[PDB]
Design an enzyme around this catalytic site. Structure first.
Site, PDB file in Angstrom:
ATOM      1  N   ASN A  61       3.247   9.503   7.447  1.00  0.00           N
ATOM      2  CA  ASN A  61       1.866   9.182   7.980  1.00  0.00           C
ATOM      3  C   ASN A  61       1.206  10.195   8.861  1.00  0.00           C
ATOM      4  O   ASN A  61       1.929  10.734   9.558  1.00  0.00           O
ATOM      5  CB  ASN A  61       1.963   7.922   8.618  1.00  0.00           C
ATOM      6  CG  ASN A  61       0.985   7.326   9.080  1.00  0.00           C
ATOM      7  OD1 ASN A  61       0.248   7.891   9.790  1.00  0.00           O
ATOM      8  ND2 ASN A  61       0.741   5.985   9.040  1.00  0.00           N
ATOM      9  N   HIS A  83      -1.754   7.260   5.120  1.00  0.00           N
ATOM     10  CA  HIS A  83      -0.276   6.757   5.078  1.00  0.00           C
ATOM     11  C   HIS A  83       0.657   7.750   4.616  1.00  0.00           C
ATOM     12  O   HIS A  83       0.397   8.573   3.924  1.00  0.00           O
ATOM     13  CB  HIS A  83      -0.467   5.240   4.252  1.00  0.00           C
ATOM     14  CG  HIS A  83      -1.020   4.031   5.070  1.00  0.00           C
ATOM     15  ND1 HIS A  83      -0.843   2.845   4.593  1.00  0.00           N
ATOM     16  CD2 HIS A  83      -1.344   4.188   6.367  1.00  0.00           C
ATOM     17  CE1 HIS A  83      -1.530   2.035   5.635  1.00  0.00           C
ATOM     18  NE2 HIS A  83      -1.882   2.868   6.735  1.00  0.00           N
ATOM     19  N   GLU A  90       2.684   7.425   2.106  1.00  0.00           N
ATOM     20  CA  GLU A  90       2.758   7.495   0.578  1.00  0.00           C
ATOM     21  C   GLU A  90       1.277   8.449   0.380  1.00  0.00           C
ATOM     22  O   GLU A  90       1.534   9.050  -0.810  1.00  0.00           O
ATOM     23  CB  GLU A  90       2.513   6.080  -0.178  1.00  0.00           C
ATOM     24  CG  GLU A  90       3.701   5.281   0.098  1.00  0.00           C
ATOM     25  CD  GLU A  90       3.522   4.407   1.259  1.00  0.00           C
ATOM     26  OE1 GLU A  90       3.608   3.192   1.172  1.00  0.00           O
ATOM     27  OE2 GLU A  90       3.186   4.990   2.493  1.00  0.00           O
ATOM     28  N   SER A 123       8.132  -0.372   2.506  1.00  0.00           N
ATOM     29  CA  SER A 123       7.567  -1.230   1.302  1.00  0.00           C
ATOM     30  C   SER A 123       5.963  -0.680   1.406  1.00  0.00           C
ATOM     31  O   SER A 123       5.207  -0.923   2.385  1.00  0.00           O
ATOM     32  CB  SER A 123       7.862  -2.843   1.356  1.00  0.00           C
ATOM     33  OG  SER A 123       7.457  -3.289   0.123  1.00  0.00           O
ATOM     34  N   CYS A 137       1.642  -0.794   1.295  1.00  0.00           N
ATOM     35  CA  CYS A 137       0.815  -1.763   1.655  1.00  0.00           C
ATOM     36  C   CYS A 137      -0.209  -1.653   0.401  1.00  0.00           C
ATOM     37  O   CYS A 137       0.179  -0.954  -0.687  1.00  0.00           O
ATOM     38  CB  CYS A 137      -0.077  -1.048   2.679  1.00  0.00           C
ATOM     39  SG  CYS A 137      -1.176   0.219   2.433  1.00  0.00           S
ATOM     40  N   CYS A 184      -1.527   1.781  -0.837  1.00  0.00           N
ATOM     41  CA  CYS A 184      -0.491   2.794  -1.594  1.00  0.00           C
ATOM     42  C   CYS A 184       0.116   2.062  -2.649  1.00  0.00           C
ATOM     43  O   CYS A 184       0.420   3.042  -3.704  1.00  0.00           O
ATOM     44  CB  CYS A 184       0.607   3.014  -0.523  1.00  0.00           C
ATOM     45  SG  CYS A 184       0.295   3.866   0.993  1.00  0.00           S
ATOM     46  N   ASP A 191      -2.522   0.485  11.881  1.00  0.00           N
ATOM     47  CA  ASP A 191      -1.999   1.515  10.645  1.00  0.00           C
ATOM     48  C   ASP A 191      -2.177   0.189   9.435  1.00  0.00           C
ATOM     49  O   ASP A 191      -2.335   0.855   8.315  1.00  0.00           O
ATOM     50  CB  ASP A 191      -0.677   1.943  10.955  1.00  0.00           C
ATOM     51  CG  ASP A 191      -0.386   2.851   9.586  1.00  0.00           C
ATOM     52  OD1 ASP A 191      -1.057   3.955   9.544  1.00  0.00           O
ATOM     53  OD2 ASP A 191       0.802   2.904   9.101  1.00  0.00           O
TER      54      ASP A 191
END
Ligand SMILES: O=C1NC=C[C@@H](O)N1
Ligand SMILES: O=C1NC=C[C@@H](O)N1
Ligand SMILES: [Ca+2]
Ligand SMILES: [Zn+2]
Ligand SMILES: [Zn+2]
Lengths: 154, 153
Positions: B46, B57, B59, B84, B86, B89, B150
């Site tokens: 991030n 982010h 990912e 995990s 969002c 992503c 975020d």
């Protein structure tokens, strides 16, 4: 979804962004984020794949990025304007930030399951069928098919 | 199933999470690996605080760091993320057709994106890595406001 008094303004900004990116040699897709109340422009942008060798800066992502870091609540009463029907990535961004409304220029040249997914997730979606957008994107696809394919991971 | 590069990928993702944490940002890292020969196409974390970014982010940063690639390249890879994904992503995994998504933990955070990935025919593996869990929980405890930002809360 019903139209809003800022739709014409939002889509014009988006098309201009798409024209900007076109001149710069990139994918002609622009957008902007606007407050549903005063019609203020939080930010605007266009696809930066070619301008920055970016695999994630689609028109919608670039727009959000150009708005800068914001408090979550700020997104809750805005409308994201995009010249082309959002891909699953851009759809996800809208859903994550809680942007309740998405106005799309056209979904003739491209459409993903995202447009319907947004509605399924409690988001309002409006397709304007803007001929300027459709025509501009139509040209890019015909003239640089492989660059377009890459933009959508094909 | 169980890909043979999973310990490699998750470890790199964790290293990225530490780096980012040391830089003062959200402790979430990742990497994309080629399933056939285990090549590491890219890695990142991030960059919200490091670049004042609202879209980078863990990912997304990782995908960005892999650079422009042929669509087919993504079709046989595994995306590793310490947390995990969002919805945003998740949407990136789906758009590029990345087949697998190995997750460090979904205790500190979990969106509808996890099940959606499965609905879209993707493979989802939650390793429940305590090192990732502790690190992420520490950040949330120390800077809750930064965390909510975020995830758009
Ligand atoms: O820049 C973009 N490229 C492709 C699709 C749209 O989601 N935006
Ligand atoms: O960096 C990240 N922030 C929030 C969620 C996860 O998708 N990754
Ligand atoms: Ca090609
Ligand atoms: Zn997109
Ligand atoms: Zn995310």
């Amino acid at each position: 979804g019903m139209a809003s008094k800022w739709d014409q303004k939002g889509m014009d900004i988006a098309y201009e962004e798409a024209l900007l990116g076109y001149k710069e040699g990139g994918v002609p897709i622009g957008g902007c984020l606007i407050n549903n109340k005063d019609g203020s422009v939080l930010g605007r942008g266009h696809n930066m794949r070619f301008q920055k060798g970016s695999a994630t800066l689609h028109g919608e992502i670039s727009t959000l990025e150009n708005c800068g870091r914001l408090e979550g609540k700020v997104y809750k009463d805005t409308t994201l304007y995009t010249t082309l029907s959002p891909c699953e990535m851009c759809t996800g961004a809208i859903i994550m930030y809680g942007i309740p409304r998405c106005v799309i220029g056209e979904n003739v040249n491209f459409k993903s399951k995202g447009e319907k997914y947004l509605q399924t997730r409690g988001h309002e979606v409006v397709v304007v069928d803007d001929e300027r957008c459709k025509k501009l994107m139509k040209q890019f696809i015909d003239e640089r098919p492989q660059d377009w394919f890459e933009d959508i991971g094909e």
